Subunit: 49 residues, 6 copies
């Protein structure tokens, strides 16, 4: 049920490599659900940068 | 059985990148249970350094 | 389900290491389906940089 | 075998983990005492 | 199904660390099938060196 | 089909970090079988250099 790349995209958001645009591209591609993208974006951007 | 990101968050607690505030964000997102966050926080913060 | 190297090739595209010619080689090798190569290339190349 | 066996073995081999840390891991339930003793049978910091 | 170290050896070929010498060792050891070694070698050797 | 740490020890042998001694300690601990240790040692040590 959880997307295979959830951890991958969460980590990219945490290190500030992924932008809001790239999270939307992932949702469009079906690599994340909108709910997962929203969950990831609730974390602080680049907190592990 | 344990959350997929348990090891991921334990490692960031041990390396001193994750704070208690980050642990709260992870629990709120549903990426850790409160019990797992409490377990992680029983380890010495920044021990690896 | 998904090809084992989907994440591996997506990451290489995102970090700008993989080119469209490399994606063709991966499809030819059978390590990606054409659908997965098309999905990866829809992401914007090099976006991690 | 505990999920973090490999993770703690690696930390012992690169010399980041101490015996005190291995005890904290066992107390947390992330390693069994048997696994902690197995890890400690390896040379500490060998990877260096 | 797929050998566990397929991705590992493909990455070593792309980064130029592996040559057919390594591919032969892995096949002999049973860490790769000949078909997988052949698939890996169809990629450009050392393409991801940098 | 094989020990969980097979790949981990093979990579350490190929990286040149692991020695023959280390491989025998892994067999002793039961983290590698003697067959796996022998298989790993058939590879060129430190090849990734």
């Amino acid at each position: 049920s959880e997307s295979l790349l959830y951890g991958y995209f969460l980590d990219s958001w945490l290190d500030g490599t992924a932008s809001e645009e790239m999270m939307r591209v992932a949702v469009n591609a079906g690599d994340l659900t909108q709910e997962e993208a929203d969950k990831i974006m609730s974390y602080p951007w680049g907190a592990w940068n």
